[PDB]
């Protein structure tokens, strides 16, 4: 028996990027042309890429040609597949199989395969923010809490740029959900809380989302 061991596969977002790799055991890849194959949710096998012995010639299936790059390491026995700007239909199990035979030739089938690794390309390429008020309970503090937006960045202004003094817009934090969240605050005179209107202008160019939120006492 001989073995191949795919790694790196998981959840992805459309127009995002991932890299797969395949290790091996009981054999050396330095003799073999190495191939990537996938099984789509529709159940059919698609060939994806190959790279020759001696790393000479790299070839691709026409759905991934130009978008993907195949790579190899003949010494530690690893193969790689960069997947730049993935499509929703790049969702598949991705297998790494060796072109091979007991005696090798200038043309053979795939005589050993690894168990395959799942890749899912979720269709949400950009997510637009939610915006929530940070309500002011001398000097008072108020703000806006931008949340659940992808990718960065978000820009925030206050009163269309007329209110700049005392404003702090914080660096975003990356949540364990894979989505970003930032807060923008401003300190102002407590006396102005009844008359002055405070509006934070949240712009998210990647989703083409604009939100104007008025922040007022509860």
């Amino acid at each position: 028996e001989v073995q191949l061991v795919e790694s790196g596969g998981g959840l992805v977002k459309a127009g995002g990027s991932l890299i797969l790799s395949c290790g091996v055991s009981n054999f050396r890849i330095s003799a073999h042309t190495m191939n990537w194959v996938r099984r789509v949710p529709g159940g059919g096998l698609e060939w994806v890429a190959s790279i020759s012995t001696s790393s000479t010639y790299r070839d691709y299936a026409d759905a991934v040609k130009g978008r993907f790059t195949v790579s190899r390491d003949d010494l530690e026995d690893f193969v790689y597949l960069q997947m730049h700007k993935m499509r929703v239909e790049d969702t598949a199990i991705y297998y790494c199989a060796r072109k091979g035979s007991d005696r090798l030739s200038d043309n053979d089938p795939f005589d050993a395969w690894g168990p395959g690794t799942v890749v899912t390309v979720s269709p949400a390429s950009t997510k637009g923010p939610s915006v929530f008020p940070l309500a002011p309970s001398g000097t008072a503090a108020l703000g806006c809490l931008v949340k659940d937006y992808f990718p960065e960045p978000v820009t925030v202004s206050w009163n269309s740029g007329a209110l700049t003094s005392g404003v702090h817009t914080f660096p975003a934090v990356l949540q364990s959900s894979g989505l970003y969240s930032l807060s923008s605050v401003v300190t102002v005179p407590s006396s102005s809380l009844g008359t002055q209107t405070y509006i934070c202008n949240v712009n998210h160019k990647p989703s083409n989302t604009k939100v104007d939120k008025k922040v007022e006492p509860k």
């Binding site: 042309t33 191939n35 099984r39 159940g43 059919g44 096998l45 698609e46 060939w47 190959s50 020759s52 010639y57 070839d59 199990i93 297998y95 199989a97 035979s101 200038d106 043309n107 053979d108 089938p109 795939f110 005589d111 395969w113 690894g114 168990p115 395959g116």
Partner: protein
């Protein structure tokens, strides 16, 4: 460039049946075909490494043929082991292409789905998520369609389906579909329904419930 025209897309049979399958190249190749089995979610296994040319260690029940344009695979009395997909491949020096695999499956008469709809448990709902489940408990053959309607509004994009492979005692397929909604959105509407069509049904079947009733 070559495309493979494999036929049928699904073959129905049973234990001890001798079966034949056929791959037809869209333009001629020099007998450069090979054939694979694939069990669900597994790696394929090579059976035949050139047309009619069985790989060593492969069970003797397998066979095939090739004429430079038309080709076959044949199995000499199916085992329960053989009820998997089969793929033809045309392999060139630095590229390949495969047939849309012939799915081999255990045969029976057509059977319509028993449909059941489940509301979210109150215990799920208080956490803020509502998962509504539609079950097509047993049917044959595999191909069925389920659509969700919320307040008679055809839904789109908020459900995930999975099918169990053939049952060990009756060989039927089964489907479940999960409609996912946050607690907020779920409490916005009353009726939650799933509508089913299948080979055995003369009209669509709908199961529904009213939220809170």
């Amino acid at each position: 460039d070559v495309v493979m025209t494999q036929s049928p897309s699904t073959l129905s049979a049973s234990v001890g049946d001798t079966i034949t399958i056929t791959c037809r190249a869209s333009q001629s190749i020099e007998t450069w075909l090979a054939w694979y089995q694939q069990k669900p979610g597994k790696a394929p296994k090579l059976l035949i490494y050139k047309a009619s040319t069985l790989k060593t260690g492969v069970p003797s029940r397998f066979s095939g043929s090739g004429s430079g344009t038309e080709f076959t695979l044949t199995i000499s009395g199916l085992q329960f082991d053989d009820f998997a997909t089969y793929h033809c491949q045309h392999y060139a020096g630095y590229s390949a292409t495969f047939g849309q695999g012939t799915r081999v499956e255990i045969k029976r008469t057509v059977a319509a789905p028993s449909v059941f709809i489940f509301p979210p448990s109150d215990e799920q709902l208080k956490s803020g998520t509502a998962s509504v489940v539609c079950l097509l408990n047993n049917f044959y053959p595999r191909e069925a369609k389920v659509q969700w309607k919320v307040d008679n509004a055809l839904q789109s994009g908020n459900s995930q389906e999975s099918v169990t492979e053939q049952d060990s005692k009756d060989s039927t397929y089964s489907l479940s579909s999960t409609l996912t909604l946050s607690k907020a959105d779920y409490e916005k509407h009353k009726v939650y329904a799933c509508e089913v069509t299948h080979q055995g049904l003369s009209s669509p079947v709908t199961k529904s419930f009213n939220r809170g009733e």
